[PDB]
Amino acid sequence: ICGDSTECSNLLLQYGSFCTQLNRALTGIAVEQDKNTQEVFAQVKQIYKTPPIKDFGGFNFSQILPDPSKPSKRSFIEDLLFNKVKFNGLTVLPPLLTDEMIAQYTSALLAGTITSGWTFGAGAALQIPFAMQMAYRFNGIGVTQNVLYENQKLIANQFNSAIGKIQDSLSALGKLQDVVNQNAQALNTLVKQLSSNFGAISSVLNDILSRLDPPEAEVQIDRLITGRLQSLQTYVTQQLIRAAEIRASANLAATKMSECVLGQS
């Protein structure tokens, strides 16, 4: 609002706790964004590792297991996904979890599934060979389990080709671009709203102040204050409405991670 000037701060002091409320509102939003990520990804007790062999019954998981020749240790498909997506009081805080940590949670969820099926989601991880776990899952959809063992090679080839098609279909993510776009565009409007007079002589708190004397200037500075406070309320109310939509989405993601990754649905 004011911004450096001192004639503005004493006038704005007359409005009560309007600015304390807005900072509380924005701080709650920022604390909720870390809990969103903790609820989706930190769904595992231990950090599980895959064994150095890769004898998985002919199934090939190399495009989705971590890449040891990288600082970030992401997988091939996680590398494809990451290449496709100071001011007047404004600040951006960093997330609590790095995305190295997030990639490390996801690789442990992956090694839990490939090595123990669904047992690590209900207690201690109990190893089972991958073809036998695949045969347990064929039973869960009502197919008899020799249909898997007599067709193992064909089933493994089909999995491998379908995994290969995903990178080509990747190298889509518009749902992740929209959030970034809407937020950047709503932050650009707040800054552009600072060059408007709102019905004062000018929109810059010095030229109003060095071309009039106090009784005359306080009138214009109150109009500037009113406009700039209205802009900030519009911004904060829309961030509150937009964060409740992101929370309903992270809640759906947590349920999917529980029910589709840690079990069979």
Binding site: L93, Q104, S116, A125
Partner: protein
């Protein structure tokens, strides 16, 4: 400061935003352009032969750089009156035209060159309007204009009489030279005005700057962009000034917003200790005003950095947490969790031989309080 921010005498463990850190700027550097045509008054105030009183001269000073200070302080003038405007504020205003009228009168006739007078001079030789704006300057010139035997070349209308000036005349009969400056303001776009100084220009320090009109604050730094040779300053997307060109040396300088950021206080809780650590958010830890520790989230003061890794206690950010463990506070990188290694093989299985019955709780809000307001009574 935390107790005051919360309005309480007991703070529970957490992390609280308590205030803000804002570097302070010293001195005000006022930059500006040079001064070529500073107006050569040394022709009207330095003439070898003035003009009569009944046919005064009329020079129309025009677009220039006028420095009324060399006039005002020259101490050689016996009379320097300003009417529309006091003298010291002349070198800070701008008009459309300045006229300068010149002539020569007696010594005691200088009091009729003023708005609203009468006498043979102001009646019919030279009349000043009643809302004059300029200034009147006058100085004695006995040695230049008066000559033995009488200088009969200086006439006045009374139809014409001549002062016979002679060097042995009492003061008040010796010739005085007069110049009347009249500032006028028609309705043009601009014109001549005072001068403009320019302090020095530093760098790499939060400063309060003015570049021939551009008023701002920030750190100035040597640039490597190239304007076109008529562009003064550069703007960003979202329209904020981020580069300027120095008028005198004509070099481009970037303008970075002076550092700033919230201040947070990390406390183990007053029921445990009264020690405290302080986070200056996204501030470089060399410009804050023991343990100073730099984080991706700002500069942390009052906690020591260890190499162990524990479960997160108080979240700082970017993977860093703090705890009251090692009678003090410490920093580090949180722990994702233990490390379990499944002995997977192509023909091995693990089967449980026992079980436990466990029971856990889950708490959920269903309602909140129903309130009503009466608009009019509030």
């Amino acid at each position: 400061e935390t107790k005051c921010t919360l309005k309480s005498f007991t703070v529970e463990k957490g992390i609280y935003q308590t205030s803000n850190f804002r570097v302070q700027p010293t001195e005000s550097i006022v930059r500006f352009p040079n001064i070529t045509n500073l107006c050569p008054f040394g022709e009207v105030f330095n003439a070898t032969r003035f003009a009569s009183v009944y046919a005064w001269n009329r020079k129309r000073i025009s677009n220039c750089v006028a420095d009324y200070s060399v006039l005002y302080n020259s101490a050689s003038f016996s009379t320097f009156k300003c009417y529309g405007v006091s003298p010291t504020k002349l070198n800070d205003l701008c008009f459309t035209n300045v006229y300068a009228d010149s002539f020569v009168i007696r010594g005691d006739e200088v009091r009729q060159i003023a708005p609203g007078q009468t006498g043979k001079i102001a009646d019919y030789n030279y009349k000043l309007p009643d809302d004059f704006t300029g200034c009147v300057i006058a100085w004695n010139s006995n040695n230049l204009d008066s000559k033995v035997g009488g200088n009969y070349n200086y006439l006045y209308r009374l139809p014409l009489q001549s002062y016979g000036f002679q060097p042995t005349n009492g003061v008040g009969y010796q010739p005085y030279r007069v110049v009347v400056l009249s500032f006028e303001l028609l309705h043009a776009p601009a014109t001549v005005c005072g001068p403009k100084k320019s302090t020095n220009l530093v760098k790499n320090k939060c400063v309060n700057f003015n570049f021939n009109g551009l008023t701002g604050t920030g750190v100035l730094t040597e640039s490597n962009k190239k304007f076109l040779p008529f562009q003064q300053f550069g703007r960003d997307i979202a329209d904020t000034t981020d580069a300027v060109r120095d008028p005198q040396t004509l070099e481009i300088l970037d303008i970075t917003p002076c550092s700033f950021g919230g201040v947070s206080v990390i406390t183990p809780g007053t029921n445990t200790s009264n020690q405290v650590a302080v986070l200056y958010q996204g501030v470089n830890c060399t410009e804050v005003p023991s343990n100073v520790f730099q984080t991706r989230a700002g500069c942390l003061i009052g906690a020591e950095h260890v190499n162990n890794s524990y479960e997160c206690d108080i979240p700082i950010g970017a993977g860093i947490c703090a705890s009251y463990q090692t009678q003090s506070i410490i920093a580090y990188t949180m722990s994702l969790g233990a490390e379990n290694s499944v002995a997977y093989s192509n023909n091995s299985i693990a089967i449980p031989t026992n079980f436990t019955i466990s029971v856990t709780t889950e708490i959920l809000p269903v309602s909140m309080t129903k309130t009503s307001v009466d608009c009019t009574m509030y």
